[PDB]
């Protein structure tokens, strides 16, 4: 379990106004949450007074009273609307502002801490993790401290307010609904579990066939070489039959379970309202109280569930922020920002190392230094020589205060480096690295990085002394030319000379050189060397380099070995001692996817039309019942709004409740029918699409496969996951569209039948709510995209900084980098403030229009009832039939798996299916001559790989072999041997030239007919997850193979001497799940599989390159008989294995260099 930091440390950076924002936003969120159940209370009381005035009606004085007091209730609604408007605006705006400020401070402090850390801490964490953290986990913190906390508080406030308003009216109904609530919770949990697990269970069911699919797409070469498509396709089809069976069972079980859960919650609602009606008949409650309690408690209980995503967001926010807080709190051993320490002056430049012991913290168990003791006087030149990894780089890093030594001390002019502060020490010492890194900025700012207060004239003087004066003038924009990867790629020496200019502009007292000219060509090496030896004068320098010519003129050329100093002398002394230096001297000297339209996708499933017809006819009746639910609800509510004897009221109330239950039962059975039929249609669609796409993939040649855009993983994703969503485009899409259409139509029509004015007003005030919702979603998406695109600018600076941590630390420019990051953060800060304000406004308007809509609609309804245009029951009918219809439309649309993913999947699926290969495998259009002979010839054969068309893989190849003659094709891996094997198998058609079979080109022959006559054994013998008998029978596919042929093939391959050793001989299973076999045995079974077909031409491709000698002898024994009487092609990396070969051809980038005999 990942640790968390909790409240005491999560908020942390919050000064004054931040906590004020937090508290005000929380209070506003509480008000906003508590508003809604109060609006329900007003609804209940207004309904009660409407019924009271109606039964008073059931003369104009109390009608005027109705007008005025309903106007007062409209005022109540408008006041609630204004209050929730201001509360929502305040909550969203203040929480977003507080989160933005807090996260801005967090980002600044986190970058500052990362720049503060010592190199040692940086070396135990990879570079790639830090930037990905700084982006993603900071975004997660933004999610955690954003509006989510406000929404969580609003949800809890709704829960508590609903329960409180329920309990203050009547405890009986609240207790009944609360005791029913566990049933609703359990049913919702079941629905969530079954709905979520559906895809994972689908994957689990498919895994069986997916294993075979993955196996085939990894050995495509052999499959197409042996012509096994017409058998592996059928195996895949059988596994798909099994998958289809299990998927059908899963679909029916899941559908019936979901139907049962929905019927359960529906009956729970029905029972609760029936008990409410029974209480009403007893005279203890009124309609208003029952409506208020029921709706309030239900909405509170539903709202308490809405807080779960907020809780999860908070939890992952803490989990992400724990690492950041740990990193920032980590005080390093050496603090570059520390002002403490000595501040020396007039530094002469002497250096002293005494007993210096040091090891890398990453590899502490390995010791690098063994007590260095080095004396350097100011003024002269001291160089260090030695082998790679002998502490030279470690010595340089320790010199400039990067790693403190384990034991011993280093002093400058007799003063310890520990006493001196890090900043001044690093500023004094100048260092030149082996591989300079240049920032993506103009040369002017690159030089400016050396020091802040350097004048332009000083820059010019430094460049003149750095020999870069001449070359810079040739640049298009002189000293302001943009350089780096985006700028023109400068020469290798240009980077080195501008780096030495950057070092020299600081005018350092002590200079360090780490392989200055190691990675430079000689022409620029001479220039940079003369620059180095001109700049070396007047300063004390330490130089380490592999080339001894540069350090030949050094005053003291000290040797280095095993982290200790043994030999110390000059050129003459070193060359007279005949030590390590003398030996070194003597040895050196997505994309454009065209949409395919709904009609084509529907055509992909035209054959199963009866399933679609019954599904649509079931979806019509399923959808059209939500308005019926509304009608029955309004009728039962209005039952008590008329004056009659109690017994008739009880009778018809029970009748309506029973009708409600019966309609629920009908809904359950229709939902089961529709779900089952659509699921079966979709599964048949998926099975047929998988079969056809696998057929098409097996039909096309390898030119498709070699493309790296679509690898084995991509293809198996297409087969497994991509094709499973096609049923989202047709089927379920038709279901949701039809359901929504019927739900809107029935409600609109019945409302028009009952009352046209009120339904007109609703048809005018509901679309604006929907358009407000969609506008809010569009604004949110645009805001997120703009935020990411703007923050990419600061991310670029962050990446440029972190990846060059060594150089930026060495150049003590961390302050400048932080300052540059400051403004790049500052602009998005203002953008975030503006986005917070606009989001507050739009969310306030979205969440407020409902109350004003209620007020206006019910005012219009009251006016209508005032003059007996309609009845209150009709008002409730035309209100419910529209509002519940809209909510149901939204929810049903949410239920379905949208449409965009299905569309983008169907585009790929159709483009793959319709893709006709250049060389059609299944086509019978091809010449069928008699038995083949073996006169293979090549003329001017030219071919280019799809991956590397520019690289010459085949250019004018011309080789010849005759009947019954052994030829060899030796060469480096992938130099043409694979290409000629593939083209003989007809895997790649050469761009130019003719490959003649029996003196005639291989173009006019049918693919299977020509491929059936060749024998291919590759370097890695790939075997399939089946039996040994099946594997050997795979060798030929034109006819079945009996047991005796297998026996004689094994005897010829000599594997039979080992097959009997197996417990189950021929019946032994082979593969990963079976018994493991060695390389020699696998090669023997592979050559047996080659021989069983008995081709008259066979090719070997580096097969004997991975065989142990004991098994190699038996393999050669079998191959000596195999090659006798047959034409053989030999490819191998061993000269001994090709000694018996007669003819050899050597490939040179596809150009024949030497062909003929061995
Ligand atoms: C008077 C009236 O119509 O009231 C509504 C209703 O009040 C609300 C709250 C309903 C109601 O649903 C819930 O209470 C509910 C709660 C949690 C999870 C799922 C449902 C309703 O029960 C559910 C019912 O919805 C449906 O019938 C859907 O089409 C849904 N139904 C069933 O699955 C079902 C099957 C057999 C028996 C009863 C229902 C459906 C969803 C997807 C695919 C096919 C069908 C409706 C609109 C109502 C009630 C009755 C209160 C909601 O249901 C839907 C999906 O329409 C919840 O979200 C909507 C919003 C509606 O306003
Ligand atoms: C660190 C702590 C920062 C300040 C506290 C914050 C925490 C969230 C808000 C709590 C304050 C209001 C609590 C609700 C009570 C309102 C009636
Ligand atoms: C497509 C499906 C459309 C379904 C529409 C259903 C509409 C219903 C309307 C019912 C109106 C009241 C009649 C219910 C029974 C009343 C019995 C009174 C004694
Ligand atoms: N971060 C590190 N972790 C572990 N060992 C390291 C690390 N950095 C350097 N070393 C060690 O230092 C040596 C490599 O040093 P570096 O790459 O700077 O060049 P070098 O060996 O001095 O010479 P050259 O110029 O030929 O590369 C190796 O012995 C290596 O084990």
Question: For every residue of 390-422, which 3-state class applies, written as one string?
Answer: CCHHHHHHHHCCCCCCCEEEEEECCEECCCECH
Of all protein residues, whose CA lies closest to atom 29 belonging to ligand 4? 389
Cα dist from 980 to 668, 920, 987, whole Å: 65, 20, 9
Cβ proximity of 992 and 1075 under 8 Å: no
DSSP letter, residue 194 = H
Distance from C-alpha of 602 to C-alpha of 906, rounded to nearest angstrom? 11
How would DSSP label each residue in 1064-1121? TGGG-EESSSSB---HHHHHHHHHHHHHHT--SEEEEESGGGG--HHHHHHHHHHHHH
* Ligand 3: centre distance to CA 640 (Å): 19
Structure tokens at 435: 């591989």
Taking the CB of residue 522, how many other CB atoms lie within 10 A of it?
A: 8
Distance from C-alpha of 413 to C-alpha of 377, rounded to nearest angstrom? 8
Structure tokens at 1120: 């000596």
> What's phi and psi for 875, nearest 5 deg?
-60, -50
User: Residue 793: CB partners within 8 Å, gap ≥ 6?
Assistant: 824
Q: Where do we find the tokens 């002056």?
A: 345
- C-beta of 360 in contact with ligand 4 (< 6 A): yes
Of all protein residues, whose CA lies closest to atom 13 belonging to ligand 2? 26
User: Residue 795: CB partners within 8 Å, gap ≥ 6?
Assistant: 131, 135
Distance from C-alpha of 475 to C-alpha of 894, rounded to nearest angstrom? 60
Classify strands 372-376 and 967-970 as parallel, antiparallel or unpaired: unpaired
DSSP letter, residue 442 = B
Q: Tell how many helices (H) and how many strands (E) occur in the chain.
A: 39, 22
User: Residue 1087: CB partners within 8 Å, gap ≥ 6?
Assistant: 1017, 1053, 1103, 1115, 1118, 1119, 1122
Structural domains of the chain, with CATH: 1-170+285-339+756-869 (1.20.1560.10), 351-588 (3.40.50.300), 937-1157 (3.40.50.300)
Distance from C-alpha of 990 to C-alpha of 955, rounded to nearest angstrom? 9
Ligand that comes closest to the CA of residue 265: 1
| Ramachandran region, residue 934 (left: φ > 0; alpha: ψ -120 to 50; beta: rest) | left
Distance from C-alpha of 43 to C-alpha of 320, rounded to nearest angstrom? 45
Distance from C-alpha of 1035 to C-alpha of 1043, rounded to nearest angstrom? 14
Distance from C-alpha of 313 to C-alpha of 88, rounded to nearest angstrom? 21
* Ligand 3: centre distance to CA 628 (Å): 6
For residue 676, with 0-12 CB atoms within 10 Å meaning exposed, 13-18 middle and 19 or more buried, which class applies?
buried
- C-beta of 633 in contact with ligand 1 (< 6 A): yes
> What's phi and psi for 724, nearest 5 deg?
-80, -20
Q: For a substitution probing ligand 2, which of 8, 10, 11 has the most ligand atoms within 8 Å of its CB? A: 11
Helix (H) or strand (E) holding 979: helix 977-984
Cα dist from 520 to 396, 409, 497, 548, whole Å: 21, 35, 11, 15
Axis-axis angle for helices 60-116, 814-866 (nearest 10)? 170
Closest Cα to residue 213, out of 683, 691, 689, 682?
A: 691
* Ligand 2: centre distance to CA 137 (Å): 24
Closest Cα to residue 653, out of 640, 665, 666?
A: 640
Of all protein residues, whose CA lies closest to atom 29 belonging to ligand 1? 623
Of all protein residues, whose CA lies closest to atom 49 belonging to ligand 1? 266
Distance from C-alpha of 400 to C-alpha of 514, rounded to nearest angstrom? 12
- Is residue 430 classed as helix, strand or coil in its secondary structure? strand
Structure tokens at 988: 């790649």
Ligand that comes closest to the CA of residue 149: 2
Closest Cα to residue 413, out of 442, 447, 377, 389?
A: 377
Distance from C-alpha of 50 to C-alpha of 226, rounded to nearest angstrom? 84
Distance from C-alpha of 809 to C-alpha of 120, rounded to nearest angstrom? 12
DSSP letter, residue 783 = H
Structure tokens at 231: 């058998």
| Bridge partners, 1155 (sequence order) | 1145
Cα dist from 534 to 500, 516, 571, whole Å: 12, 14, 20
Classify strands 540-544 and 381-385 as parallel, antiparallel or unpaired: parallel
Cα dist from 180 to 44, 172, 177, 184, 294, whole Å: 22, 12, 5, 7, 12
- C-beta of 502 in contact with ligand 4 (< 6 A): no
Ligand 2 atom closest to residue 12's alpha carbon, by position in its atom list? 1
Q: For a substitution probing ligand 2, which of 8, 21, 22 has the most ligand atoms within 8 Å of its CB? A: 22
| Bridge partners, 337 (sequence order) | none
- C-beta of 796 in contact with ligand 2 (< 6 A): no
Of all protein residues, whose CA lies closest to atom 54 belonging to ligand 1? 888
- C-beta of 829 in contact with ligand 2 (< 6 A): no
- C-beta of 19 in contact with ligand 2 (< 6 A): yes
Ligand that comes closest to the CA of residue 127: 4
Cβ proximity of 47 and 291 under 8 Å: yes
Distance from C-alpha of 350 to C-alpha of 540, rounded to nearest angstrom? 8
Ligand that comes closest to the CA of residue 739: 1
Distance from C-alpha of 618 to C-alpha of 726, rounded to nearest angstrom? 21
Classify strands 351-357 and 372-376 as parallel, antiparallel or unpaired: antiparallel
Backbone break loci in the chain, preceding residues, C–N > 2.5 A: 58, 589
Helix (H) or strand (E) holding 805: helix 805-810
Q: Where do we find the tokens 């406004």?
A: 841
Where do the H-state alpha helices sit in 711-754?
Answer: 712-717, 732-754
Cβ proximity of 657 and 637 under 8 Å: no
Structure tokens at 314: 């908070």
3-state DSSP: the chain helix, strand, coil percent, rounded to 5?
65, 10, 25
Cβ proximity of 800 and 439 under 8 Å: yes
Angle at 227 between CA 223 and CA 233, to 5 degrees: 70
> What's phi and psi for 995, nearest 5 deg?
-100, 110
Distance from C-alpha of 63 to C-alpha of 69, rounded to nearest angstrom? 10
Closest Cα to residue 315, out of 144, 504, 561, 119?
A: 144
Cβ proximity of 543 and 377 under 8 Å: no
User: Residue 735: CB partners within 8 Å, gap ≥ 6?
Assistant: 615, 616, 619, 674, 678, 896
Question: For every residue of 652-711, which 3-state class applies, written as one string?
Answer: HHHHHHHHHHHHHHHHHHHHHHHHHHHHHHHHHHHHHHHHHHHHHHHHCCHHHHHCCCCC
Helix (H) or strand (E) holding 548: none
- C-beta of 22 in contact with ligand 2 (< 6 A): yes
Ligand 2 atom closest to residue 10's alpha carbon, by position in its atom list? 1
How would DSSP label each residue in 145-181? HTHHHHHHHHHHHHHHHHHHHHHTT-HHHHHHHHHHH
Cβ proximity of 514 and 391 under 8 Å: no
Q: Where do we find the tokens 């209100």?
A: 879
User: Residue 391: CB partners within 8 Å, gap ≥ 6?
Assistant: 368, 369, 372, 560, 563
Question: Residues 653, 659, 661, 664: is their CA dihedral positive or negative?
Answer: negative
- C-beta of 23 in contact with ligand 2 (< 6 A): yes
Longest distance between any two alpha carbons in the chain, whole Å: 132
Ligand 3 pocket residues where CB is under 6 Å? 620-621, 624-625, 628, 631, 659, 742, 746
Structure tokens at 720: 């497994």
Of all protein residues, whose CA lies closest to atom 56 belonging to ligand 1? 888
Go through the chain and tell me how many residues it has: 1158
Structure tokens at 640: 């008590």
- C-beta of 412 in contact with ligand 1 (< 6 A): no
Buried b (16+ CB within 10 A) or exposed e, 419-441: ebbbbbbbebbbbbbbebebbeb
Cβ proximity of 396 and 543 under 8 Å: no
CA–chain centroid gap for 824, Å, is: 27
Question: For every residue of 200-247, which 3-state class applies, written as one string?
Answer: HHHHHHHHHHHHHHHHHCCCHHHHHHHCCHHHHHHHHHHHHHHHHHHH
């Amino acid at each position: 379990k990942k640790p968390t930091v909790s409240v005491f440390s999560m908020f942390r950076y919050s000064n004054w106004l931040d906590k004020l924002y937090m508290v005000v936003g929380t209070l506003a969120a509480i008000i906003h949450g508590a508003g809604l159940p109060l609006m329900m209370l007003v609804f209940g009381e207004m309904t009660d007074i409407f019924a009271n005035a109606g039964n008073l009606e059931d003369d104009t004085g109390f009608f005027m009273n109705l007008e005025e007091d309903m106007t007062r209730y409209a005022y109540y609604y408008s006041g609630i609307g204004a209050g929730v408007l201001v509360a929502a605006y305040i909550q969203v705006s203040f929480w977003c502002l507080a989160a933005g400020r807090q996260i801005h401070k967090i980002r600044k402090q986190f970058f500052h801490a990362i720049m503060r850390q010592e190199i040692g801490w940086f070396d135990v964490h990879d570079v790639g993790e830090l930037n990905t953290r700084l982006t993603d986990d900071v975004s997660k913190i933004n999610e955690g401290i954003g509006d989510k906390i406000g929404m969580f508080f609003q949800s809890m406030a709704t829960f508590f307010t609903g329960f409180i308003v329920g309990f203050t009216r009547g405890w009986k109904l609240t207790l009944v609904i609360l005791a029913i609530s566990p049933v609703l919770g359990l049913s919702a949990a079941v629905w969530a579990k079954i709905l979520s697990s559906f895809t994972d269970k689908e994957l689990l069911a498919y895994a069986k066939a997916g294993a075979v699919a993955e196996e085939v797409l990894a050995a495509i070469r052999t499959v197409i070489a042996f012509g096994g498509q017409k058998k592996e396709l059928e195996r895949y089809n059988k596994n798909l039959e099994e998958a289809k069976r299990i998927g059908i069972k899963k679909a029916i079980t899941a559908n019936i379970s979901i139907g049962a859960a929905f019927l359960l919650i529906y009956a729970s609602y029905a029972l609760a309202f029936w008990y409410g009606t029974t209480l009403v008949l007893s005279g203890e409650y009124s309609i208003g109280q029952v409506l208020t309690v029921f709706f309030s408690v239900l909405i509170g209980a539903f709202s308490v569930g809405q807080a779960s995503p907020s809780i999860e967001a908070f939890a992952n926010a803490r989990g992400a922020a724990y690492e950041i807080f740990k990193i920032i709190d980590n005080k390093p051993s050496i603090d570059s920002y520390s002002k403490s320490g000595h501040k020396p002056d007039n530094i002469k430049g002497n250096l002293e190392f005494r007993n210096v012991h040091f090891s890398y913290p990453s590899r502490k168990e390995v010791k690098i230094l063994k007590g260095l003791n080095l004396k350097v006087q100011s003024g002269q030149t001291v160089a260090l020589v030695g082998n790679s990894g002998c502490g030279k780089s470690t010595t340089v890093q320790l010199m400039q205060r990067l790693y403190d030594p384990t034991e011993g001390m280093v002093s400058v002019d007799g003063q310890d480096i520990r006493t001196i502060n890090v900043r001044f020490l690093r500023e004094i010492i100048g260092v030149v690295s082996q591989e300079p890194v240049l920032f993506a900025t103009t040369i002017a700012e690159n030089i400016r990085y050396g020091r802040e207060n350097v004048t332009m004239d000083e820059i010019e003087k430094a460049v003149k002394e750095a020999n870069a004066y001449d070359f810079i003038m040739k640049l298009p924009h002189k000293f302001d030319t943009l350089v780096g990867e985006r700028g023109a790629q400068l020469s290798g020496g240009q980077k080195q000379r501008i780096a030495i200019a950057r070092a020299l502009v600081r005018n350092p007292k002590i200079l360090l050189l780490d392989e200055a000219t190691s990675a430079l060509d000689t022409e620029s090496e001479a220039v940079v060397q003369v620059a180095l030896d001109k700049a070396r004068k007047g300063r004390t320098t330490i130089v380490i380099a592999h080339r001894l010519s540069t350090v030949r003129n050094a005053d003291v050329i000290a040797g280095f070995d095993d982290g200790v100093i043994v030999e110390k002398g000059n050129h003459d002394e070193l060359m007279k001692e005949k030590g390590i230096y003398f030996k070194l001297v003597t040895m050196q000297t997505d994309e454009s996817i065209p949409p395919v339209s709904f009609w084509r996708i529907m055509k992909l499933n035209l054959t199963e039309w009866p399933y679609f017809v019954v599904g649509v006819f079931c979806a019509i009746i399923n959808g059209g019942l939500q308005p019926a639910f509304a009608i029955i609800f309004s009728k039962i509510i209005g039952v008590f709004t008329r004056i009659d004897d109690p017994e008739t009221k009880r009778q018809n109330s029970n009748l309506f409740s029973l009708l409600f239950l019966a309609l629920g039962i009908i809904s359950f059975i229709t939902f089961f029918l529709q779900g089952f039929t659509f699921g079966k249609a979709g599964e048949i669609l998926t099975k047929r699409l998988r079969y056809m796409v696998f057929r098409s993939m097996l039909r096309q040649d390898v030119s498709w496969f070699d493309d790296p855009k679509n690898t084995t993983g991509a293809l198996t994703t297409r087969l497994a996951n991509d094709a499973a969503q096609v049923k989202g485009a047709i089927g379920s899409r038709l279901a949701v569209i039809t359901q929504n259409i019927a739900n809107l139509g029935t409600g609109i029509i019945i409302s028009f039948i009952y009352g046209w004015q009120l339904t007109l007003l609703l048809l005018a005030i509901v679309p604006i709510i929907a358009i407000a919702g969609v506008v809010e979603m569009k604004m949110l998406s645009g805001q997120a995209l703009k935020d990411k695109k703007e923050l990419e600018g600061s991310g670029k600076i962050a990446t440029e900084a972190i990846e060059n941590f060594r150089t930026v630390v060495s150049l003590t420019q961390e302050q400048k980098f932080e300052h540059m990051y400051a403004q790049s953060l500052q602009v998005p800060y203002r953008n975030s403030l503006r986005k917070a304000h606009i989001f507050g406004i739009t969310f306030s308007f979205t969440q407020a229009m409902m109350y004003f809509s209620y007020a206006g609609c019910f005012r219009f309804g009251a006016y209508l009832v005032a003059h007996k245009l309609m009845s209150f029951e009709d008002v409730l009918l035309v209100f419910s039939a529209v509002v519940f219809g809209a909510m149901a439309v939204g929810q049903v649309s949410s239920f379905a798996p949208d449409y965009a993913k299905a569309k983008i999947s169907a585009a790929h699926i159709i483009m793959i299916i319709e893709k006709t290969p250049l060389i059609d495998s299944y086509s019978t259009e091809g010449l069928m001559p008699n038995t083949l002979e073996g006169n293979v010839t090549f003329g001017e054969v030219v071919f280019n790989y799809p991956t590397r068309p520019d690289i010459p893989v085949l250019q004018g190849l011309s080789l010849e072999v005759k009947k019954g003659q052994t030829l060899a094709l030796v060469g480096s891996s992938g130099c043409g041997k694979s290409t000629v094997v593939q083209l003989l198998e007809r895997f790649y058609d050469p761009l130019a030239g003719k490959v003649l079979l029996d003196g005639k080109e291989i173009k006019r022959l049918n693919v299977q007919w020509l491929r059936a006559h060749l024998g291919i054994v590759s370097q890695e013998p790939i075997l399939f997850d089946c039996s040994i008998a099946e594997n050997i029978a795979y060798g030929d596919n034109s006819r079945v193979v009996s047991q005796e042929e297998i026996v004689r093939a094994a005897k010829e391959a000599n594997i039979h001497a080992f097959i009997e050793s197996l417990p189950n001989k021929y019946s032994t299973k082979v593969g990963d799940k079976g018994t493991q076999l060695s390389g020699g045995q696998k090669q023997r079974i592979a050559i047996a599989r080659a021989l069983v077909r008995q081709p008259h031409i066979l090719l070997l491709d580096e097969a004997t390159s991975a065989l142990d000698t004991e098994s190699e002898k038996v393999v050669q024994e079998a191959l000596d008989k195999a090659r006798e009487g047959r034409t053989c092609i030999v490819i191998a990396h061993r000269l001994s294995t090709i000694q018996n070969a007669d003819l050899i051809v050597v490939f040179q980038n596809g150009r024949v260099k030497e062909h003929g005999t061995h």
